[PDB]
Design an enzyme around this catalytic site. Structure first.
Site, PDB file in Angstrom:
ATOM      1  N   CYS A 132      -3.821   2.318   1.148  1.00  0.00           N
ATOM      2  CA  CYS A 132      -2.486   2.790   1.827  1.00  0.00           C
ATOM      3  C   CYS A 132      -2.214   4.335   1.457  1.00  0.00           C
ATOM      4  O   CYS A 132      -2.613   4.803   0.287  1.00  0.00           O
ATOM      5  CB  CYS A 132      -1.181   1.965   1.085  1.00  0.00           C
ATOM      6  N   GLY A 161      -5.379  -0.772  -1.536  1.00  0.00           N
ATOM      7  CA  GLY A 161      -5.220   0.433  -1.996  1.00  0.00           C
ATOM      8  C   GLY A 161      -5.782   1.692  -1.274  1.00  0.00           C
ATOM      9  O   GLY A 161      -5.641   2.918  -1.493  1.00  0.00           O
ATOM     10  N   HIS A 164       6.487   1.829  -0.394  1.00  0.00           N
ATOM     11  CA  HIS A 164       6.146   0.829  -1.012  1.00  0.00           C
ATOM     12  C   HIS A 164       5.516   1.029  -2.178  1.00  0.00           C
ATOM     13  O   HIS A 164       5.103   0.008  -2.927  1.00  0.00           O
ATOM     14  CB  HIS A 164       5.432  -0.453   0.066  1.00  0.00           C
TER      15      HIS A 164
HETATM   16  O1  LIG Z   1      -0.895  -4.754   3.305  1.00  0.00           O
HETATM   17  C1  LIG Z   1      -1.004  -3.998   2.460  1.00  0.00           C
HETATM   18  C2  LIG Z   1       0.067  -3.982   1.291  1.00  0.00           C
HETATM   19  C3  LIG Z   1       1.580  -4.200   1.933  1.00  0.00           C
HETATM   20  C4  LIG Z   1       2.239  -5.416   2.076  1.00  0.00           C
HETATM   21  C5  LIG Z   1       3.202  -5.716   2.987  1.00  0.00           C
HETATM   22  C6  LIG Z   1       3.991  -4.576   3.541  1.00  0.00           C
HETATM   23  C7  LIG Z   1       3.435  -3.311   3.167  1.00  0.00           C
HETATM   24 CL1  LIG Z   1       4.193  -1.878   4.040  1.00  0.00          CL
HETATM   25  C8  LIG Z   1       2.173  -3.186   2.584  1.00  0.00           C
HETATM   26  N1  LIG Z   1      -1.654  -3.033   2.403  1.00  0.00           N
HETATM   27  C9  LIG Z   1      -3.052  -3.123   2.672  1.00  0.00           C
HETATM   28  C10 LIG Z   1      -3.442  -2.251   3.622  1.00  0.00           C
HETATM   29  N2  LIG Z   1      -4.831  -1.941   4.301  1.00  0.00           N
HETATM   30  C11 LIG Z   1      -5.565  -3.062   4.204  1.00  0.00           C
HETATM   31  C12 LIG Z   1      -5.343  -4.252   3.118  1.00  0.00           C
HETATM   32  C13 LIG Z   1      -6.289  -5.009   2.825  1.00  0.00           C
HETATM   33  C14 LIG Z   1      -6.252  -6.048   1.648  1.00  0.00           C
HETATM   34  N3  LIG Z   1      -4.769  -5.971   1.047  1.00  0.00           N
HETATM   35  C15 LIG Z   1      -4.146  -5.196   1.463  1.00  0.00           C
HETATM   36  C16 LIG Z   1      -4.041  -4.113   2.391  1.00  0.00           C
END
Ligand SMILES: O=C(Cc1cccc(Cl)c1)Nc1cncc2ccncc12
Ligand SMILES: O=C(Cc1cccc(Cl)c1)Nc1cncc2ccncc12
Lengths: 304, 304
Positions: free
Chosen positions: B145, B143, B41
């Site tokens: 990820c 961030g 992603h």
């Molecule tokens: O959720 C996401 C981005 C995303 C969205 C949809 C699909 C995928 Cl594969 C990835 N990553 C995050 C990871 N951990 C914690 C978070 C906290 C806040 N914002 C984002 C976060």
């Protein structure tokens, strides 16, 4: 989101760990620049651990009696000296992996990461706090002596603790990196009084702000309190008294959530008087006091 | 003595972390040999995250569009490919700090250490478990990820997890190092069902053995049970069913304490039917399921 008992990444400390052997005793040492720091009870046998005269026991030791091994390679000891309860072994080589560092003496209530070590090799890392009675609730086995506690600011490792002893109560006592024990403890094989251990009030409040930040808000109520009223409740429940310095450090968290510090004290008061009623807060069924207000900010902001 | 939620020392993983930027998105990457692994992603903008055709989005990307930075120095990308939900960026230099490693897919109930990272820099390390519903209860911000989960056997790091997503419930979903998500989760910006999360019964039993080992024995009773009787209680309380494989792995702990596995199940049963009654076990007021029987043995033995 999510809240974890997170420790600092341990890599910078891993590269400093060595094994120190003296006679039949082996413990861990901390190699920084050309000096290896280790607990002075390394020169002792179980027999003289009942009442050791460290000055007299060190007189029978020479630089060649201290065996310092870094991983698989031997370091040459060119000097030795005792500073309080730690031994400083000057070696002929500066540790190529010495990070930027400071030796700091922390205050009770402050937290730190511990890199548990056996034979100069690391086994694991965990977060813990210096208790108000100057003990740490660690996880340590025989041979863990010399394991260090630390904090990290950007690239600088601030060494605060060095493990020495386990009390009969299964709690841990140790020193700063200058050899001064935190608390009344001496490095002897005698039963020693730990002292009354209060709960770190400013940290439970900071943990409660972290709960609100990460979604857990059931404990929030329609009440407020004053510092003097709250302190009466804290006294009854063996919580440290809250001062205006505590309220000052909780400013950023109060500003992030919009819950005034005294309003959050009123939630603490009601949780203390009424309990959790079978509910949980950040996956815990008790009030957690081992996250400082700085820790909560750092965990909820992402400081590297 | 003492029992802590201990993580593996993170040094070997710290030396593998890099920052990967693609377009306007920046996340973490894992540099091993001449390959950088990161979540796919990274090629996405918030607009196409609603329903991305990753194959089509990757067609518009070239090796020069992936910016890989190790600390402060840039790596040259000579190849790129997609394997399931991860991108593999071939770089022209082998990571001098690549440790001995394996890519393993863990089973639910198994635990692992996580090295949380922002911009290729580590912020902290923590221990966690792959939940029976294939989510992890992490602590992750935007961030994070690309942050990896791992285990360590002597010198070999077994990479098991790579963080990708946070569900609307504040729980975390991610993949093994081959790009296969644990569970039903897809890498899309859609609400996804986590599923019923049971308690890992074999781990609570192992934690109860650790409590006996470290002094906490109030919960021990004069009863025994059978696997079928205990499983009726586990069903009611949303605990995973116990099998003879579970009893087999609890052998070493049963032998260390002398408490038969079914005798300890009877203690678990009574704690489930009666609660802790305001008491604690290893400083917890709930039954902890994030220590496997291997973890308890290792923590109570000192494996480095
Ligand atoms: O959720 C996401 C981005 C995303 C969205 C949809 C699909 C995928 Cl594969 C990835 N990553 C995050 C990871 N951990 C914690 C978070 C906290 C806040 N914002 C984002 C976060
Ligand atoms: O207690 C001691 C040795 C000692 C005795 C008396 C005074 C001093 Cl300064 C040191 N060190 C240990 C540390 N942590 C945990 C342990 C677990 C088991 N055995 C020993 C442990």
């Amino acid at each position: 989101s999510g809240f974890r008992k997170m420790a600092f990444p341990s890599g910078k400390v891993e590269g400093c760990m060595v094994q120190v052997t003296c006679g039949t005793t082996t413990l861990n040492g901390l190699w920084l620049d050309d000096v290896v720091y280790c607990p002075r009870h390394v020169i002792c046998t179980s027999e003289d651990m009942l009442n050791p005269n460290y000055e007299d026991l060190l007189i029978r030791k020479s630089n060649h009696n201290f065996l310092v091994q870094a991983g698989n390679v031997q370091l040459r000891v060119i000097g030795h000296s005792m500073q309080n309860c730690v031994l400083k072994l000057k070696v002929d080589t500066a540790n190529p992996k010495t990070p930027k560092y400071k030796f700091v003496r922390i205050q009770p209530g402050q937290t730190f990461s511990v890199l548990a070590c056996y034979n100069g090799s690391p086994s694991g890392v965990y977060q813990c706090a210096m208790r108000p009675n100057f003990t740490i609730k660690g996880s340590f086995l025989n041979g863990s002596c010399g394991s260090v506690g630390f904090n990290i600011d950007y690239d600088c490792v601030s060494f605060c603790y060095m493990h020495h002893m386990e009390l009969p109560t299964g709690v841990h006592a140790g020193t700063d990196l200058e050899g001064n024990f935190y608390g009344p403890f001496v490095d002897r094989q005698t039963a020693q009084a730990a002292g009354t251990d209060t709960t770190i009030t400013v940290n439970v409040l900071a943990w409660l702000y972290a709960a609100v930040i990460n979604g857990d808000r059931w404990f929030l109520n329609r009440f407020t309190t004053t510092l003097n009223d709250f302190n009466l409740v804290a006294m009854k429940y063996n919580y440290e008294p809250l001062t205006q310095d505590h309220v000052d450090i909780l400013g950023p968290l109060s500003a992030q959530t919009g819950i005034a510090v005294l309003d959050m004290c009123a939630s603490l008061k009601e949780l203390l008087q009424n309990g959790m009623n079978g509910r949980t807060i950040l996956g815990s069924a008790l009030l957690e006091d081992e996250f400082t207000p700085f820790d909560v900010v750092r965990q909820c902001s992402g400081v590297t």
